[PDB]
Design a protein around this ligand. Structure first.
Ligand code: HEM
Ligand code: HEM
Ligand code: HEM
Ligand code: HEM
Lengths: 143, 140, 140, 143
């Protein structure tokens, strides 16, 4: 994904301060809460009825850690997103049957989580840069 | 369709939003224009630069519309009849743009109210904004 | 949101569909599984071949639900509550699948009623199926 | 677009009996009628208020002929859809700003028009093949 030098520097600087252990779980739990039909793919994670049970699930936290690791791996290879997410796209398309719209929803939830965690430091330009990186990850996964 | 619980959550969240509605709406419009430049084609007579008085005024109008929709959440279709006609019959706005503006409003609310934006409140506001967008995009 | 005009068009079109509803629903289910094989994952216990008795029975059930929805167009959320709690609460169906099934129903109605499927009737049936999907995809 | 030899033979045979002048115009008119926000792009064409005015528009008929000619050109190069629909993709994205969902909507309307014009001969396998061809045209245009 093509980014300006300012956008790349801002994105790297803001991702350097991201607490992975909490942010990944926050994004996954908020996806499962706001879009409840996504719990069909995570029914094996245990209790996912109430928001307080979704957000306090160790399996959800670990899976969000994995998701943020994948997002960081993609952020380190912005010019090769399609090749970076080949195995993950195959896994999601052939074995799990996850619709491509779910990736966009998860990216939007992650952007909302980043805005929640960083407040005024999440300016509209930083949000635009993160929007395009999230869209690139979603299009790479949908391929 | 909204339940009573998320309706109460939305009412409380917007009541705690309170008087910053104009600034929040202006920031939401700025975020939508910056991150989704295709939406700029619906505002060709506007000055879409940062700190624009026209964008601030439009954000104030959008925020007032959201406030009266919060006040009239149970009967949205007839409380937003004038706006629904302008969006659908006159402007003909793609509902994708409504989804984009709803997302930018959620991002603005997350950035400006950390304590208020709980995961439940997030879901309630998401589906409230979805109902508002559906009402405004419906042609009847 | 529906107008009186498309409500009348939908009621007339489905009344003219009448007794072929079961066959039309079976064909709609068959078309969807072949066109979009991802939807087959919601029916792992079914026999998804052509002319299957289970598929024909489920098509009959879907067609009966659609006829009841036609008969109760103005109170759809309170009419299809059992189906709303089935698909949203337990099945957890993605609304994309509802869109696909609505499209396949439209294709079946076009292929079986050329004279009936006028462009206005097409718009009316599209909006009616969208309303039904929105009712079935909501939580109370 | 990957197709079986049977699917390609079925697609080509149905296409030969397709009346371009009627089919393209009817698909475009039904798009404009069912999805009224699409008339923002077609405001230059003329009166587009009633369904009878949308269907009785010579500009709509001519533009539908152009659209179905592009569809035929895509069918003739089904293994090179991305390269065939590059100029049109650039035209629709850079100059017209058409949302990619609109291509999917128009493809679905075209499939409905084909079903309407071919009746019982539009079997579920033929519809599946055409759904895949329409998706490939839409993905090549949205690139
Ligand atoms: C959009 C960006 C996404 C990224 C970067 C991502 C990343 C990953 C990664 C790295 C794994 C590997 C986990 C492992 O190997 O144990 C995984 C698995 C999985 N993903 Fe995603 N994912 C995304 C979107 C989604 C969405 C939106 C859903 C569902 C709505 C989903 C459903 C799953 C499931 C069910 C698994 C398997 C979990 C398990 O078996 O325990 N993914 N994902
Ligand atoms: C989602 C909730 C929305 C609300 C509550 C809302 C509300 C409003 C309000 C109150 C006005 C002022 C009308 C007047 O002063 O006469 C307006 C105008 C307008 N809206 Fe929206 N709107 C929404 C979404 C959108 C979106 C997403 C777009 C486009 C991407 C849009 C496009 C416009 C345009 C072009 C105008 C005309 C402004 C002008 O001519 O100065 N609206 N809307
Ligand atoms: C307008 C759209 C739809 C209508 C009117 C509808 C209606 C129905 C009806 C009447 C039943 C029977 C309930 C019962 O026998 O207890 C049912 C069950 C079911 N539906 Fe739907 N449905 C729609 C869309 C969908 C879609 C698109 C899917 C999946 C892709 C789906 C998945 C299911 C499943 C898995 C069942 C359970 C069937 C069984 O257990 O035998 N539904 N639906
Ligand atoms: C598979 C989908 C589509 C195909 C194959 C297609 C094809 C074409 C073709 C062949 C042209 C003529 C360009 C030229 O002659 O230079 C064109 C122009 C155009 N298209 Fe599309 N189109 C598609 C979808 C859409 C949709 C869904 C919209 C709007 C909602 C749209 C809006 C336009 C407009 C406004 C023009 C220019 C009309 C004019 O200049 O008079 N297109 N397209």
């Amino acid at each position: 994904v093509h980014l300006t030098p300012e956008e790349k520097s801002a994105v790297t600087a803001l991702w350097g301060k991201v607490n992975v252990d909490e942010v990944g779980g926050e994004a996954l739990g908020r996806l499962l809460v706001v879009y409840p039909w996504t719990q069909r793919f995570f029914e094996s994670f245990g209790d996912l009825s109430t928001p307080d049970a979704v957000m306090g699930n160790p399996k959800v936290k670990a899976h969000g850690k994995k998701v943020l690791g994948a997002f960081s791996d993609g952020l380190a290879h912005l010019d090769n997103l399609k090749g970076t997410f080949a195995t993950l796209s195959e896994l999601h398309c052939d074995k799990l049957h996850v619709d491509p719209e779910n990736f966009r929803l998860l990216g939007n939830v992650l952007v909302c989580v980043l805005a929640h965690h960083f407040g005024k430091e999440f300016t509209p330009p930083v949000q635009a840069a993160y929007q395009k990186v999230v869209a690139g990850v979603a299009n790479a996964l949908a391929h | 369709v909204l339940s009573p619980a998320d309706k109460t959550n939305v009412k409380a969240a917007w009541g705690k939003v309170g008087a910053h509605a104009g600034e929040y709406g202006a920031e939401a419009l700025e975020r939508m224009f910056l991150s989704f430049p295709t939406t700029k084609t619906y505002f060709p007579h506007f000055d879409l630069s940062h700190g624009s008085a026209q964008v601030k005024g439009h954000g104030k109008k959008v925020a007032d519309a959201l406030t009266n929709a919060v006040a009239h959440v149970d009967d949205m279709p007839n409380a937003l009849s004038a706006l629904s006609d302008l969006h659908a019959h006159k402007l003909r706005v793609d509902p994708v743009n409504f989804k984009l503006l709803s997302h930018c409003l959620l991002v603005t609310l997350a950035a400006h109210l950390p304590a208020e934006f709980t995961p439940a409140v997030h879901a309630s506001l998401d589906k409230f904004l979805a109902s508002v967008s559906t009402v405004l995009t419906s042609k009847y």
